[PDB]
Amino acid sequence: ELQEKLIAVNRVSKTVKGGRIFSFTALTVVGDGNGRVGFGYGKAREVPAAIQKAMEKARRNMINVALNNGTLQHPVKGVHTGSRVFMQPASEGTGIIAGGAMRAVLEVAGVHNVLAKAYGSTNPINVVRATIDGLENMNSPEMVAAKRGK
Amino acid sequence: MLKAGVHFGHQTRYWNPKMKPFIFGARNKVHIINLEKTVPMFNEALAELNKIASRKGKILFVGTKRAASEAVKDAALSCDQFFVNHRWLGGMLTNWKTVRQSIKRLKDLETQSQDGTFDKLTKKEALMRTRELEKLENSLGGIKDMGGLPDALFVIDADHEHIAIKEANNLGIPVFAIVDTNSDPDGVDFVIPGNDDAIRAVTLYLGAVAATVREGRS
Amino acid sequence: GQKVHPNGIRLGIVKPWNSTWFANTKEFADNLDSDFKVRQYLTKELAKASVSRIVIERPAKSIRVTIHTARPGIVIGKKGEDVEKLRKVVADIAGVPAQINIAEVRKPELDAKLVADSITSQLERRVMFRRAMKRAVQNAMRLGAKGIKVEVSGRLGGAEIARTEWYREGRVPLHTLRADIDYNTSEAHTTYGVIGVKVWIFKGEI
RNA sequence: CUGCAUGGCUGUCGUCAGCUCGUGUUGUGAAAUGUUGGGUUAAGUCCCGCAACGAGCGCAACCCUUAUCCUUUGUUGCCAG
């Protein structure tokens, strides 16, 4: 039950020379559904091809997480080009919730029980890389305690 | 090894600060490497090369410098290595995600030349298209069965194979080099004493290192 | 615009002609009306035959028919003598002895008349139109070609409106006069729409 | 009456030189790099060198034709031997 998820679509229109041209960009995620996350950028002259390039990069990208029991133990921040994504462990209700570009990212990591906001740039290609910087930043307790001698 | 005590090569007063610990003195007025340490320095790196080959790491030999421009396959035909002898440029290894199209194009010939469909005319394929395959075997045949990027790189001279060192240091590939009297280990991760301009010597030296890559089939 | 009539004005360019006939100009309209009549009774004994096109030549005191088929067995029938029915349906209309030639189609999944049939018979079975359209192109472009375009119209994928969507691979020179384009329009004619497909195939100039 | 409902028919920059597919490398990215530099051309044209390569399209080539021999014709045309 591995699932390949889309975050956002963008269209960039440029006057040439005489007349105009336009291309589309997509941002997708695949990961592993538990403890591993991965994302891809894709750009083409049509939406289905931009998504197809993005999936072909997202299956060839990976990040390992310090994850246990599908959940967070501490608040964490991650930053990329003005996106300052801050994450809190969410309990006793709905698990998603959170910013519109984060909902698939948490679910392909297996951590879709988290309240997250962007606190800056809302641009999805900054937001995803600030959310993933937070999944890279988090650690186990376990390791934050195991830094002690013996 | 020195056997009858004979010593040859380049440089009779000059040597670089990075070679300072290898040279012991001079013989036949040429600077000589310490004969007590040559064999264990050579064996040290040759065992790591055998271990890379024993975990299915593929070994790429660069023979652009004249003393190996044929010997890299003519003195190594039963060693299970891959080879390059053409002049290097930017992208000469780092562009592999594109250059794989030429590998796909080579396999499309050697999957057709074996069939009787290729033989039924006098020259249209059985001469004109064998001349097309034998042309691409010359420039890419020495890497056609490798795939992706190398797991170790070997060079005859770090002064002349310097762009193969550059492209390997861009991909993260460990580099093995031969040294004698003037060498810079910047971008090189293993060094061994040997020959770089012999007429002679290099043919036997290539068999003394590359045969440990076919031991990786064990 | 700039779609033109490929089966009309473009069909006489870099291609062999499908009819050749002489008549007195005082009866030209009646001999043009019979050029259709000698097809009307014939394309009903080819109804299963996967024919890409037919050619009907009317020399003096003669009529000569060529059939370009993907299935040469189904036009010759039991013991291979049932091909004479293709003469007898036109000789009974023209009132002169008729000749028949059966010609083989090279790569029947690269011929525009037959590719549009192989898409229409999938749309009648309610398959996802993009799957049939993309498989028709990935098949044809691997059999040969320099480029191909497909355009599907009517009730696309379960849509509440008629619509039109297309897909193209390689080059399709529609504004070039010497391009030798192979074309067809087909229609499925259902209780719930007309459901149409149009295909343009390019394989080489002249 | 109206291209201010269309299709077809063509008109134009213009024989202008430039436009894409599979790709590499660089940047968060618009996009860049290459297609820049040295020589040159009818021309992103042909070369030299280089972080770029293959494959296509247009150009050129291809197709049409003219300036003059050779062989074939040989008349009620031509006429040298």
DSSP per-residue codes, chain B: --TTT----S-SS---GGGTTTEEEEETTEEEE-TTTHHHHHHHHHHHHHHHHTTT--EEEE--SGGGTTHHHHS-SSS--EEE-SPP-TTTTTTHHHHHHHHHHHHHHHTTTTSGGGTSSSSTTTTTTHHHHHHHHHHHTTTTTT-S--SEEEES-TTTSHHHHHHHHHHT--EEEEESSS---TT-SEEEE--SS-SSSHHHHHHHHHHHHHGGG-
Structure tokens of B132? 């097309």
C141: number of Cβ within 10 Å: 16
What are the tokens at B46?
């040759």
Q: Which nucleotide is nearest to B100 (CA to C1')?
A: D23
From the centroid of its chain, how far is CA A83? 12
**Sign of the CA dihedral B97, B98, B99, B102?**
positive
- Contact criterion met (CB below 8 Å) for B176 and B49: yes
Q: What are phi and psi of C62, to 5 degrees?
A: -150, 160
Residues with CB under 7 A from strand D: A 12-14, 16-17, 21, 23, 25, 41, 43-45, 49, 53, 56, 80-81, 125-126, 129; B 89-91, 94-95, 97-98, 101-102, 163; C 1-5, 9, 146, 171, 205
Nearest nucleotide to the CA of B166, by C1', is: D51
Q: B29-50 in b/e burial notation, b at 16+ Cβ within 10 A? A: eebbbeeeebeebbeebbeebb
Q: What is the distance between the alpha carbons of residues B188 and B166, in angstroms, rounded to a whole number?
A: 10
- Give the integer Cα–Cα distance in Å for C3 and B72: 61
Residue C80, token pair as written in the block: 């291979």
The structure tokens 């770090």 sit at B158
Q: Is the dihedral of CA A123, A124, A125, A128 positive or negative?
A: positive
Among C53, C27, C26, smallest CA distance to C42 is for C53
A18: which nucleotide lies closest, measuring CA to C1'?
D13
| Nearest residue: Cα versus C1' of D57 | C171
- This structure was determined by cryo-EM
List chains adjacent to chain A, taking adjacency as at least 3 C-beta pairs closer than 8 Å: none
- Which residue is closest to D24 in terms of CA–C1' distance? B95
Phi-psi region of B73 (alpha: psi -120 to 50; beta: other; left: phi over 0): alpha
Beta bridge partners of C150: C167, C199
Q: What are chain C's partners, defined as 3 or more CB pairs within 8 angstroms?
A: none
Residue nearest to nucleotide D6 (CA to C1'): C1
Q: Radius of gyration (Cα) for chain B, nearest Å?
A: 20
Can you give the distance from the CA of residue B123 to the C1' of nucleotide D71 in angstroms?
Answer: 35
Nucleotide with the nearest C1' to B102 CA: D54
Q: Tell me how far apart the terminal alpha carbons of chain C are, to the nearest angstrom.
A: 25
Between the CA of B166 and the C1' of D2, what is the distance in angstroms? Answer: 72
* Spatial separation of the C-alpha atoms in residues C30 and A102, rounded to whole Å: 74
* CB atoms near residue C50 (< 10 Å): 19
Q: Which residues pair with B176 in a beta bridge?
A: B154, B190
Q: How far apart are CA B211 and CA B195, in angstroms?
A: 18
**For B164 and D35, how far is CA from C1' in angstroms?**
27
What is the spatial distance, in angstroms and rounded to an integer, between the CA atom of B14 and the C1' atom of D79?
Answer: 97
Neighbours of C192 (CB within 10 A): 8
Cα C167 to Cα A49: distance, rounded to the nearest angstrom? 12
CA distance B183 to B195: 12
Q: Using an 8 Å Cβ cutoff, are A54 and A26 in contact?
A: yes
Distance CA C114, CA C32 (A): 27
**Which tokens in the block code for residue C204?**
């080489």
The residues, any chain, with a CB within 8 Å of residue C49's CB and separated by 6 or more, are C67, C69, C70, C71, C74, C75
C114: three-class secondary structure by DSSP: helix
Q: Which nucleotide across the nucleic acid strands is nearest to A81, CA versus C1'? A: D28
Q: Is C179 helix (H, G, I), strand (E, B) or coil?
A: coil
Distance C8 CA to D2 C1' (A): 29
Strands (E), C133-192: 147-153, 164-170, 182-187
Answer yes or no: are the C-beta atoms of C202 and C145 closer than 8 Å: yes
CA distance B60 to B147: 12
Query: Quick one: B196 exposed, middle or buried, by C-beta within 10 A (0-12, 13-18, 19+)?
Result: buried
Q: What's the CA gap between A26 and A6, in Å, rounded?
A: 8
The CA angle B193-B199-B205, to the nearest 5 degrees, is 35
- Please state whether the peptide bond connecting residue C148 to the residue before it is cis, i.e. omega within 30 degrees of 0: no
Nucleotide with C1' nearest the A57 CA: D23
Q: Name the residue among B31, B50, B20 with its Cα closest to residue B190.
A: B50
Report the DSSP beta bridge partners of residue C170: C147
Q: Distance in angstroms, CA of C31 to C1' of D64?
A: 36
Structure tokens at A15: 């006057």
Of A15, A18, A6, A21, the C-alpha closest to A108 is A6
Judge contact between C180 and C191, C-beta under 8 A: no
Structure tokens at C65: 């028919």
- Complete edge-to-edge strand list for the sheet that includes strand C196-202: C164-170, C147-153, C196-202, C182-187
DSSP output for C31-54: HHHHHHHHHHTTTTSSTTS-EEEE
Identify nearest nucleotide to residue A126 by CA to C1′ distance.
D28
Backbone dihedral region of B178: left (phi > 0), alpha (psi from -120 to 50 degrees) or beta? beta
* Residue C174 · residue C181 · CB < 8 Å: yes
From the CA of B89, how many Å to the C1' of D52?
9
Nucleotide nearest to B163 (CA to C1'): D51
Q: Looking at residue C182, what DSSP letter applies? A: E
Contacts 24+ apart (CB under 8 A), C40-45: C41/C89, C41/C90, C41/C92, C41/C93, C42/C86, C42/C89, C42/C90, C44/C89, C45/C85, C45/C86, C45/C89
**In the structure encoding, which two tokens stand for residue C179, read together?**
């391009």
The residue with tokens 């005489």 is A18
Q: Which nucleotide is nearest to A21 (CA to C1')?
A: D19
Q: C52 is written with which tokens?
A: 């890409």
CB burial string A34-46: b at 16+ within 10 A, e below: ebbbbbbbbebee
Amino acid identity, position B100: R
For A16, residues 6+ apart whose C-beta sits below 8 A from its C-beta are none
Query: SS3 for chain A, per residue?
Result: CCCCEEEEEEEEEEECCCCEEEEEEEEEECCCCCCEECEEEEEECCHHHHHHHHHHHHCCCCEECCCECCECCCCEEEEECCEEEEEEECCCCCCCCCCCCCHHHHHCCCCCCEEEECCCCCCHHHHHHHHHHHHHHCCCCCHHHHCCCC
CA of C120, C1' of D54: distance in angstroms = 38
C42 neighbors C60 (Cβ within 8 angstroms): no
Which among B202, B178, B215 is positioned nearest to B70, based on CA atoms? B202
Our measurement of CA B163 to C1' D48, in angstroms, reads 21
Return d(Cα C37, Cα C160) in angstroms, integer: 40
Half-sphere exposure of B177 (CA within 13 A, CB side): 24
Distance B88 CA to D49 C1' (A): 13
Coil vs helix vs strand at C154: coil
Strand order in the sheet with C51-58: C19-21, C51-58, C63-69, C98-104
Q: Which two tokens stand for residue A145?
A: 């305690």
Longest dimension (CA), chain B: 67
Nucleotides of D under 7 A from a protein CB: 6-10, 19-25, 28-31, 50-54, 56-58
Subunits close to B (at least 3 CB pairs below 8 A): none
* Token duo for residue B79: 């060693």
Label residue C16 exposed, middle or buried (CB < 10 Å: 0-12, 13-18, 19+). Answer: exposed
Q: Kindly give the pairing relationship between strand B59-62 and strand B82-84.
A: parallel
SS3 assignment, position C200: strand
Residues 6+ apart with CB under 8 A from C116: C184, C185, C186, C197, C198, C199
Alpha helices (runs of H) in chain C, residue ranges in sequence order: 28-40, 73-76, 85-94, 112-123, 129-143
Phi-psi region of C59 (alpha: psi -120 to 50; beta: other; left: phi over 0): beta
CA distances from C89 to C55, C56, C67, C122 (A): 15, 13, 14, 32
Collect all residues with Cβ–Cβ distance below 8 Å to B34 and sequence separation of at least 6.
B22, B23, B24
Give, in Å, how far the C1' of D49 lies from the CA of B107: 32
The residues, any chain, with a CB within 8 Å of residue A38's CB and separated by 6 or more, are A29, A30, A31, A32, A58, A59, A61, A62, A63, A108
| Nearby residues of C36 by Cβ (< 8 Å), 6 or more positions away | none
For residue C146, give the nucleotide whose C1' atom is nearest its CA: D56
- CB contact at 8 A, A114 and A124: no
Give the CA-to-C1' distance from B177 to D6 in angstroms: 76
Q: Which of A99, A115, A110 is nearest to A7 (CA)?
A: A99
Contact C116, C186 (CB under 8 A): yes
Gap from C132 CA to D67 C1', in Å? 60
Is the backbone peptide bond immediately before B200 cis, with ω within 30 degrees of 0? Answer: yes
Distance B217 CA to D54 C1' (A): 35
Torsion sign across C-alpha atoms C199, C203, C205, C206: negative
Burial grade of B177 (CB within 10 A; 0-12, 13-18, 19 or more): buried
Nearest nucleotide, C1' to the C-alpha of C1?
D7
- Separation of alpha carbons B111 and B100, rounded Å: 17
Give the resolution value in Å.
15.0
Handedness of CA A115, A121, A126, A132 (dihedral sign): negative
Which residue is the nearest neighbor of D8, CA to C1'? C4
